Paper text:
In particular, MASP-2 CUB1-EGF-CUB2 (subsequently called MASP-2 3D) was crystallized in the presence of citrate that chelates Ca2+, and although Ca2+ was bound to the EGF-like domain, the CUB1 and CUB2 domains lacked Ca2+ and became partially disordered as a result (Feinberg et al., 2003). Because there was no structure of rat MASP-1 3D, and the existing structure of rat MASP-2 3D lacked two of the three Ca2+, including those Ca2+ that form part of the binding site for MBL, both rat MASP-1 3D and MASP-2 3D were crystallized in the presence of 2 mM calcium and diffraction data were collected. This resulted in one MASP-1 structure at 3.7 Å resolution and three independent MASP-2 structures at 2.6–2.7 Å resolution. For MASP-2 3D, 279 of 280 residues were visible. Interestingly, the three structures overlaid closely, with RMSDs of 0.682, 0.871, and 0.992 Å over 276 Cα atoms. The only notable differences were in the N-terminal seven residues and in a loop within the EGF-like domain (Thr125–Ser130), probably reflecting flexibility. A major difference, however, was that the structures now contained three bound Ca2+ compared with the single Ca2+ in the EGF-like domain of the earlier MASP-2 3D structure. In the MASP-2 CUB1 domain, Ca2+ formed contacts with six oxygen atoms in the side chains of Glu48, Asp56, Asp101, and Asn104 and the main chain oxygen of Ser103 (distances between 2.3 and 2.7 Å). In the MASP-2 CUB2 domain, Ca2+ formed contacts with five oxygen atoms at the side chains of Glu215, Asp225, Asp262, and Ser264. The firm identification in this study of the three Ca2+ sites in rat MASP-2 now resolves a key ambiguity of the earlier rat MASP-2 structure (Feinberg et al., 2003).
Numbering used by the authors:
A (entry chain A), B (entry chain A): 2 to 278
Amino acid sequence: KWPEPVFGRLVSPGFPEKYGNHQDRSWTLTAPPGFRLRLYFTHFNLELSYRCEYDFVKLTSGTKVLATLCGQESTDTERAPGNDTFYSLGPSLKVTFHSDYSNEKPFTGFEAFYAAEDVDECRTSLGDSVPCDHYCHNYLGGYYCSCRVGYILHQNKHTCSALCSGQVFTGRSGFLSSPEYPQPYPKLSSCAYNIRLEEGFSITLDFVESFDVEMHPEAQCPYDSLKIQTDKREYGPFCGKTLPPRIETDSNKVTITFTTDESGNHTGWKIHYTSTA
Amino acid sequence: KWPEPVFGRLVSPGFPEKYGNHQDRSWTLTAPPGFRLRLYFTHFNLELSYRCEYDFVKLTSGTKVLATLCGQESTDTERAPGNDTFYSLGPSLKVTFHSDYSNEKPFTGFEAFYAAEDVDECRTSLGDSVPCDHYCHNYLGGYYCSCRVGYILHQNKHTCSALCSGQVFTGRSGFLSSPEYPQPYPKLSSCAYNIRLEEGFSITLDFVESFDVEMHPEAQCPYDSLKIQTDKREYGPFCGKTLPPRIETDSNKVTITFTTDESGNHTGWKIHYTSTA
Ligand SMILES: *[C@@H]1O[C@H](CO)[C@@H](O)[C@H](O)[C@H]1NC(C)=O
Ligand SMILES: *[C@@H]1O[C@H](CO)[C@@H](O)[C@H](O)[C@H]1NC(C)=O
Ligand SMILES: [Ca+2]
Ligand SMILES: [Ca+2]
Ligand SMILES: [Ca+2]
Ligand SMILES: [Ca+2]
Ligand SMILES: [Ca+2]
Ligand SMILES: [Ca+2]
């Protein structure tokens, strides 16, 4: 559908000769998705007038008026292109030439050259939001993203969900924490921790260093959910910014599930588990 | 033939797990003509050894060995990629992974991402030669060139030949010169000047300000030829760096042809023609 590259040349009527009066002309340049248009002038010589009302070349991209060019050299109220480069917003750019009823001097019009180039969606905005969560990979006509080690790309193909499940503890004591603790825990992750001991023991849980899981002031914990499910009962969900109290379970088996939503920079939780008999 | 964009992912055997011993592997990435390949690593952790003889990832583009990467962080004799970006020479790039018989530590190998990007043939080399004579226009997978006003693109589609022919002088006196005089005259141009007066007059030719047409020390004027053809005889070809003597023709018609080759920065000639009866 777009097998050939997009480029070309635009000229005022009669170029390189003098352009006429009462002329109205336009070119609509379109590129494939993922591309934008780059336009520049090899030649520009038009009638100068206030706000370029008489003769002009107008570059519009969508509803935006990218440029209104007149004259030979720019003023405080008029712009001439010179060696400037004009980039379309999106894969289309419209160029309109208009001339009024008269020319005092024999103005020779314009010559411009355009070409489609790739958009780099992985650009470093130095202040704005970036497409993908971890690694951004740009290619001609598109982009895609990937994640660091320990993650898999979410269904939305941008978020990096943590490989947080899979941990099984058979030891008498130990530590388990939210992913990347004490650094902010990842987004859209479903982490399941298992603790399985022999039939004689009971497991004790201690929230130890810092607790900070996203919380709403009215609804309690609709964003990120830390639940503790044993054999006797279940505990939670836990949310907030202070250490939850000690949990003396009467069981030898306990599963801790921790789910996260798509936003937040909360630093998470850490649990030291012990056991007695 | 190349309807889809070129991009992809490369990993060491077993990534993200430990890579094995006695492994030999390679990927040959190819882009369409006009494109080159851009490769970078999201992950790199290999065995360090002198000149990366034991384990390595080698980037070769043609006969050139672009890189030989080992270890975690670079040394005086070994290189590790880090965040560096590697560009192929031409539309192909080969990547070779090799591992020897043993690994002391559990090295986790590499992850790399590549994509085809356009070559900008119109680049500003800041010292080298530029593709086209006047204006260079880059597009995806290629380039083309154009000329200033007064020129047409030569058959070779790079050189700008001057629209130098077409001038006819009916006046009693006047000036004709090589194109762009006193600036160096263009290349591969065939310029014909005509001087046509009434039957009663004879035309006088004066080489006036400066003469500088390309000349060979043995063969006289095989590069650029300035010939003067009247009704009685012909004069020339003229070449060299000094003003030719006055030419009193006995005719009312004279054609001056001036042809140029594909190189040279010689400033040209200027002729003031007069006439009497
Ligand atoms: C504009 O570009 C041309 C080359 O295409 C160059 O000769 C000229 O110097 C440039 N003008 C400026 C102000 O850089
Ligand atoms: C390498 O790139 C990553 C982003 O992909 C960035 O986090 C890291 O700081 C970069 N390293 C350096 C030394 O710039
Ligand atoms: Ca006008
Ligand atoms: Ca892109
Ligand atoms: Ca959250
Ligand atoms: Ca090894
Ligand atoms: Ca190109
Ligand atoms: Ca020459």
